[PDB]
Each structure stands twice: as C-alpha cells, then as structure tokens.
Design a protein around this motif. Structure first.
Motif: not given
Length: 49
Positions: A1-19
């Motif tokens: 959000q610093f650069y104004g780019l939007y990514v869907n929540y599922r693609h981020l939560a998947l990585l956060c659950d993988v780690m």
DNA sequence: AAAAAAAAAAAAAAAAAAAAAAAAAAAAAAAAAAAAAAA
C-alpha cells in the motif's frame, strides 16, 4: 500500500500460512525450504543440489 | 673400410558483497565430593 498496489487477500494469506505452518519461522531461503520434509528432487531443484 | 663421439630432429610431459549456520575458546556461576576444625 506504500506504492498503491493492490493484491488480493487470499494470495497473501496463503504465503503467511505457508511460513507459519511448521510452528516456527520457515523463511524462503535455502535454510527454510531445504529444511522441510519434502522430497529430495524437489529440494535439489531449488538450491544446493 | 669399420667403429666411436657430438650435434640436431622426434616424442612424451607437466605447468565481490551479504547473510546465516556451525565450530571454538575464554569465562563463569553452580553443584557435588573431599579435607579440616571443633565440640
């Protein structure tokens, strides 16, 4: 959000659950991927073959 | 005319920065065992 780019929540939560799957911090390096319980050919294809 | 020494050609040989994990060495408090003083 610093650069104004939007990514869907599922693609981020998947990585956060993988780690956080193994109970500790599994980094995306050769020290977190190659220390997993996956196969030998999968781990040798990334780094330190 | 036959035998030996030195010179030259041919063939094999050896000579960059970053970051994380593991190992190591000095230190340092803790705890169990052995020796001494006193009642």
């Amino acid at each position: 959000q610093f650069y104004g780019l939007y990514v869907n929540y599922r693609h981020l939560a998947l990585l956060c659950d993988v780690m956080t799957a193994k109970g500790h911090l599994m980094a995306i390096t050769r020290h977190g991927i190659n220390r997993q319980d996956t196969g030998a050919l999968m781990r040798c294809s990334f780094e330190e073959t």
